[PDB]
Structure formats: structure tokens, C-alpha cells
Structure 1
Amino acid sequence: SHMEVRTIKVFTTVDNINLHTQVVDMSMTYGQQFGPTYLDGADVTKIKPHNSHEGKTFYVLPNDDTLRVEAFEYYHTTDPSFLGRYMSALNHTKKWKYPQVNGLTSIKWADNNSYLATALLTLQQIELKFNPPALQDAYYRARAGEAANFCALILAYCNKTVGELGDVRETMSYLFQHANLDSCKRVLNVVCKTCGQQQTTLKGVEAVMYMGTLSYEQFKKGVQIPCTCGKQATKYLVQQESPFVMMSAPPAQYELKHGTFTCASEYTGNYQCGHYKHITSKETLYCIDGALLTKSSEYKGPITDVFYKENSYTTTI
């Protein structure tokens, strides 16, 4: 026997701004009508419409020409599963806590998220503007204290699920790919006693990141690196134009001196079985570990990333 058809009006979206009116049959699941569907992060694909859902907004995958354009303009991605990864992470990050620690939005530990807490604290201390409007909107909310959307977007952009381990340097590199760093320029010189000098110019993300030493002062004086001839070449910073620099190295015992750096990330333990902490240099040295806070006049620990302020630098060598 035919059951009389019942419908409700709902809206679908890929960006929570542009809405698309839909009339849904309450005898069929959201999945049968829209494909994978989410209500504020919760997966409702296998759910049949409820009367209470009338007029609500549901996220869907951008599986039509209009949604494809709206999703590209908002997120700067055409990765087919992006929206699903974003919603899946959001269902968890909306339950995390974001305490204000020393005036910054932190994240209380959950789901192995210490790498995200130190990335978030770091972003609030360096001059950086995101390109996708999704990151601009969510980062503004994160700075105000509501970082759930921003954290779920970091996870989606980095291809990490909630609970999955992450590397801070890798996470910052992904975020920098979605930032406006076109005014950043680095000029390096590599000198070999045999092979001579070779100058290189780096732009954008490559102009603000360096892997090999934590010391910006030592990078300016010269660092010893291998040469193709077998000898050691000296690489030094000739020119730098950027509002910050990020120096990274495999974690090792290192002394952080108050007033000589902006902030840093510490990794205690072996690779894939450790924990990150954040050190910020303000009136004194503050150590932020998610919701936890301690202070000290000096600091020594296994540091893996250090951030420094910059504007314009030219060598004397």
C-alpha cells in the first residue's frame, strides 16, 4: 500500500553562507537524496528526515557544478573528499576545549592534538594572512576563542584525521601553502673552497622555512652543509625580507634565551611516540602545554622548531 508522501524543506551548503533549498521525502534517508550529508559535523547520511530538521542547514559534498565552484572559491580545493574530512574532524573538534592561556587561544589535550595546539599558539604570534576565505573566517573565530572550525580545517587541509599523529613543521608548511607569502624573499649563498660560490633566491613558503639549524644567528654567520665534491660548503643568509622566519631541526637539547626568539616547539620522546610543548618568550619564558602553563627565567629542552621576528635583513659578508 502507498504511504502518503511527506516532505520538509531544508537547505544544503558547502560553505555555510550560500544556501540551496531542497524538498526532502521523509521516507528516504539523506544519503539516498543528497549523498553523504552532515548536520553541524554529525553524519546524517543514514538518517531519515525529522520534523525538527525543517529549515536547518546541512553540508553535502560539492557534487554539482554550482557547489563545485562555491567549494573551490571558499576552500581553494577540488579534493573530492575534502568536505567529508572537514565535517568528520569538526564533529570531534566542536567538543574539544579552547582555554585562553596567557592571552592566546590554546587547546586542551585530546586525541593526540599537542601538534595542533603548538601550531595554533604559534600562528597567533606571527604575521600571516590566509588565502582561502574558509581559513580567514575560521582563524578570526579561533583568535576570538572559538577554534573548532579552524582546527577541523587544519586537519582536512593536512589530510590528518582526529587522533592521527602530526608533525608541526609539516603542518606549518601546509598552512603556509594557503597563506599570502608573495612578499617573502630569501637570498642565500653557498660557498665551497673547491667549487666556488652559488647564490640562490627563494620565494614564498621556501623563503621563510629552513631545515637544518634552530639558530637564526648561526644561519646568518654560516652553516656547514655537504657539497657534491665531498667537502663541507658554507651556506649563509645574504638577504631576508619577511615578517618572520621558522628554523627547524631534528629535536636536540637546546637552550632558548629570553628575548632572542618569538616562540618554539619542543618534542620530548622518540619519533612517533612523544609529545609537543610550546615555549613563548614574553616578559619571561612561558611553557604552554595545551591547557597547562608554567614559567621559568631560562629554558633547555629538545627543541625542534623556533620562530623569529624579521622585517628586512642584509648581510655584511
Structure 2
Amino acid sequence: LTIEVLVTVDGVNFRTVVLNNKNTYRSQLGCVFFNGADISDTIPDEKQNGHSLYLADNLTADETKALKELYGPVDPTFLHRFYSLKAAVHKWKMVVCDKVRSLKLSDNNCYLNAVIMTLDLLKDIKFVIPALQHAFMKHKGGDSTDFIALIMAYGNCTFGAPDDASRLLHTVLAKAELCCSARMVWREWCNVCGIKDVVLQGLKACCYVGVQTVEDLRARMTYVCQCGGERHRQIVEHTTPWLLLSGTPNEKLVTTSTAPDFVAFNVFQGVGHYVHARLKGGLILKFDSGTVSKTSDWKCKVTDVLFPGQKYSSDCNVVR
């Protein structure tokens, strides 16, 4: 007729809550998850007495603090969306392929395979957000469920919907940080406004959206200045541990040999499908969502391309 439950937001700190059987959990407490089940619209009964619940809204001040410290500044629906995802993707299998883990195709999740396999190549990145960092470590140790559900929640991904690998990869990488230093110095100039430098540091210096080759990235770019005249930009210095370049699907013929400068790339095939590729030992290792395959030549549409560390200084006075 009345029960006691433990309520948490972090799996560490629980508060005791007393409930009766005269309204639903949602009326008395909030949106609650009991071992992955949304029992919010249930009338509490004996079989939940003593059990631990995850709360997703109507937090105490102390819980709101732990939420922000653990997950970051998230929107109200976050915890709800995360709990749902965590449960929905529990059944996803991480298949071992050529000694590398890959995400088996289920529910249009092919884009997540490209994302996770690409992240696994990125040397020495950590996530600022503790919950995400713990999940990532847990993922590298063989349990990928929390990490998959977390990046899906932060990325506003919907279970079962097809999505874009480049989109999520950059959205996830926006929440990371490097162990070393990284620098990118853009030199900008206009004949009216004058000359200024724009520096990007750390993770913002390793990722770029809009070109897919280093030659195009390092090129003089011309656009319209805020004064309406002609403005120019050019990388004048670039030091990074790796470089991820992303563009729209680009039909290309990848061959070995000659040795490409890039160590991996992602491909789109067109709902659409995503394949992760690595260059290892003079071959292209195609990872098709739990599947491997090897070829020396591939005509594919590349999207993201991953390069090794950059050590670049211009030996040109780019302004003249």
C-alpha cells in the first residue's frame, strides 16, 4: 500500500523516496526507469519496493548539480532520451573483425559504425564530460552500450532513423580535447580592413569541414568580407597529432599503390549506407558494419578522410 524506492541520476548517489499506490510514479515523483523500463505511468506496487530507479525529470537541486557536473549543460529531455536509447541499443552487438571491433548492422545504425571506428583511430583523445569519458573508456574495454547511447543522445539521434556519419562525428568531436597541443594559424587579409590572424587551438585545429585534401585545405581561400569587398584566408602554420577533413560525398578512385597520405576514410553509398575504410599494409580494409573485406582498389564516395599529424609552416608571404 506504500513503498520505498531509491532514486538516482548518476548510479552513485541515491535518495530514498516514499510512494503510495494512489497515483502513478509520474504524478508523485517523475519520469522513472526501472532497469531500462519506463515505469512512469505505472501505479507503484510491492514489487518495486527497495529497488533502484533512474529519474529523468523533477530533480532535486542536488541532482541537478550532479547532472550538470556529470553530463554537462544538457536540455531537460536529455536524461529521458538517454535512458530510452540505452535500453533500445542494449541488444546491439560489437563484432570482432580483423582484431578490430565494429558495430553490427541493425536499425539503420551503419552511420554509427563509421563514427565509432573513426574515433577508435584518433590517438589520445579524451572527453571533457565525465559521463562521456567513462563511457568511452568502458567502450574501449569491450562494453559499448553506454557510449553508443550517449553520443546518440548528445547528437539528437533517433533510434532506428538513418543519419549522417560526418554530422555525428563532428558533433561528438566538439565535446573532446587533446592530450598534446595543436595549432592552426589562418592569415586573413582585405585591401580595406587590413590583415588579421585567426588562431584555432586543440581539437578545433584537427577537424575541418569543407575540403577533403590537405592541398585544398592549405590553399588560398577567397570569400566576401564584412565590408563587402574581397577577403582572403590561408593557413600559414599547422601543427596537429592527426587531421580529420570532411566533405560531401565525393566520387574518387582510391588505390594502393601509390600510397595515399591518409590512413583511413569513410564512404557513403546511394536511404544510404556507410562504410569505414582503413589503409593497412598496402590494402584498403573495408569494414561494412560487422564485416571485413580487402581490395587494393576502390571506386567509392569518400566523406571523412583521416590524415596523420601535420607539421606545416608556410614559406610564403601569403599576403603578397
What's the TM-score bracket when you normalise by the shorter of the two chains?
Answer: 0.7 to 0.9
- Aligned position for 2:82: 86
**1:116 corresponds to:** 112
Query: What residue in structure 1 maps to residue 147 of structure 2?
Result: 150
> Is 1:294 the equivalent of 2:289?
no
Asked if the contact 2:177/2:203 (under 8 Å) is kept, the reply is no
Q: Indicate the RMSD between aligned Cα atoms, in angstroms.
A: 2.7
Q: Would the aligned equivalents of 2:6 and 2:14 in 1 still touch at CA under 8 Å? A: yes
2: CA distance, partners of 1:193 / 1:104? 52
Question: Hey, what does 1:10 align to over in structure 2?
Answer: 5
Q: What residue identity is the alignment partner of 1:22?
A: V
Query: What is the CA-CA distance between 1:285 and the residue it aligns to?
Result: 1.5
For the 8 Å contact 1:263–1:279, the answer to whether it is kept is: yes
Name the residue aligned to 1:210.
208
Secondary structure of residue in 1 paired with 2:246:
strand
- Letter in structure 2 aligned against 1:301: C
The answer as to whether partners of 1:6 and 1:25 remain within 8 angstroms in 2 is yes
Q: Tell me which of 63, 69, 74 is aligned to 2:70.
A: 74
Number of matched residues?
307
Match of 1:260 in 2: 261
Identity %: 29
Change (3 A) 1:256 1:223: farther
Alignment of 1:1-317 (within 5 A): 5-7=1-3, 9-26=4-21, 28-49=23-44, 51-62=46-57, 63-127=59-123, 128-181=125-178, 183-189=181-187, 199-220=197-218, 222=219, 225-227=222-224, 235-256=233-254, 258=259, 260-269=261-270, 273-283=271-281, 284-310=283-309, 312-317=311-316
Separation in 1 of the partners of 2:297 and 2:193?
A: 42
Deviations 1:193-224 (A, max 9, x none): 9998654322344322222221124423x255
- Whichever residue aligns with residue 265 of structure 2, its letter is A
**d(CA) in 1 for partners of 2:222, 2:310:** 26
Which amino acid is 2:15 matched to? H
Q: TM-score, normalised by structure 2?
A: 0.85
Secondary structure of residue in 1 paired with 2:212: coil
Hey, what's the Cα distance between the residues in 2 that align with 1:174 and 1:40?
Answer: 29
Unmatched runs of 5 consecutive residues or more in structure 1: none
Contact 2:188 2:231 in 1 (8 A): no
What is the alpha-carbon distance in structure 2 between the residues aligned to residue 112 and residue 295 of structure 1? 23
> CA 1:169–1:230 in 2, change beyond 3 Å: closer, same or farther?
farther
Judge conservation of contact 2:72–2:129 (CA < 8 Å) in 1.
yes
More displaced stretch, 108-117 vs 256-265 = 256-265
